[PDB]
Amino acid sequence: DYSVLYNSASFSTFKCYGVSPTKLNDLCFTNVYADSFVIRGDEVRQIAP
Amino acid sequence: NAQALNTLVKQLSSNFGAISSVLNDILSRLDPPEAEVQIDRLITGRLQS
Amino acid sequence: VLSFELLHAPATVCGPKKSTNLVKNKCVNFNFNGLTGTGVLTESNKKFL
């Protein structure tokens, strides 16, 4: 669930590509792969499909 | 008549450049106007069929 | 980045989503693992592998 993530850390950018962010709790996730990486703030805009 | 109808029915399986051939997928996946963009492609394709 | 598929494997993750009892013989709306639709549900003779 993502509604339990706002109390731990305030997310500044929560954009979901290919799926609505308000419909995550209405479907069923399949094969969730965590791809975490720390980059510069001037390079976040390049990360897009 | 069987060749005509089994073409008319089978064209329901065609994508016409939408996200899926099955309209319920679109309505259950996307939301707002981004869903209607794909629906207009299916309408145009099924209507021309 | 959270990458996940949709309708490609049996349910094993899902979310905090309410699940109903099953109903049969009536005209009903249904949602099986995200497969939203409308119809009549019955038993079947079908020899699924």
Side-chain angles (χ1 to χ4, degrees):
Chain A
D1 188 10
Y2 65 97
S3 59
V4 300
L5 303 180
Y6 297 93
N7 58 271
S8 60
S10 180
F11 295 157
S12 60
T13 300
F14 202 172
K15 180 60 180 300
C16 298
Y17 297 91
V19 61
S20 299
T22 60
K23 299 300 181 60
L24 301 180
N25 299 330
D26 300 70
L27 298 180
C28 191
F29 298 92
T30 296
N31 300 330
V32 180
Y33 304 101
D35 301 70
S36 302
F37 55 92
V38 180
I39 57 180
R40 193 179 299 181
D42 299 330
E43 308 297 329
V44 187
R45 58 179 299 270
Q46 298 182 0
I47 306 298
Chain B
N1 283 285
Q3 290 165 7
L5 290 179
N6 292 352
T7 303
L8 178 70
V9 173
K10 195 171 186 180
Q11 282 289 65
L12 295 170
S13 72
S14 298
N15 296 303
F16 305 96
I19 192 66
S20 176
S21 61
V22 172
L23 181 67
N24 297 12
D25 302 351
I26 314 186
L27 296 167
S28 61
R29 255 119 104 265
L30 313 163
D31 210 21
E34 94 242 16
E36 267 86 273
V37 171
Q38 319 293 303
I39 300 176
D40 184 66
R41 290 181 188 168
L42 291 188
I43 286 175
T44 303
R46 291 176 177 198
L47 176 64
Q48 183 168 9
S49 172
Chain C
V1 179
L2 300 180
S3 180
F4 57 93
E5 301 178 358
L6 296 178
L7 298 182
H8 287 77
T12 179
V13 182
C14 283
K17 221 283 182 179
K18 180 60 176 54
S19 58
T20 69
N21 192 20
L22 180 64
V23 165
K24 287 174 174 172
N25 312 306
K26 301 191 188 185
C27 290
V28 291
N29 291 338
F30 57 75
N31 180 351
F32 289 87
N33 314 292
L35 176 56
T36 55
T38 304
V40 171
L41 304 184
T42 66
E43 296 79 7
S44 72
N45 63 277
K46 287 173 178 162
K47 306 302 180 179
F48 274 43
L49 307 180

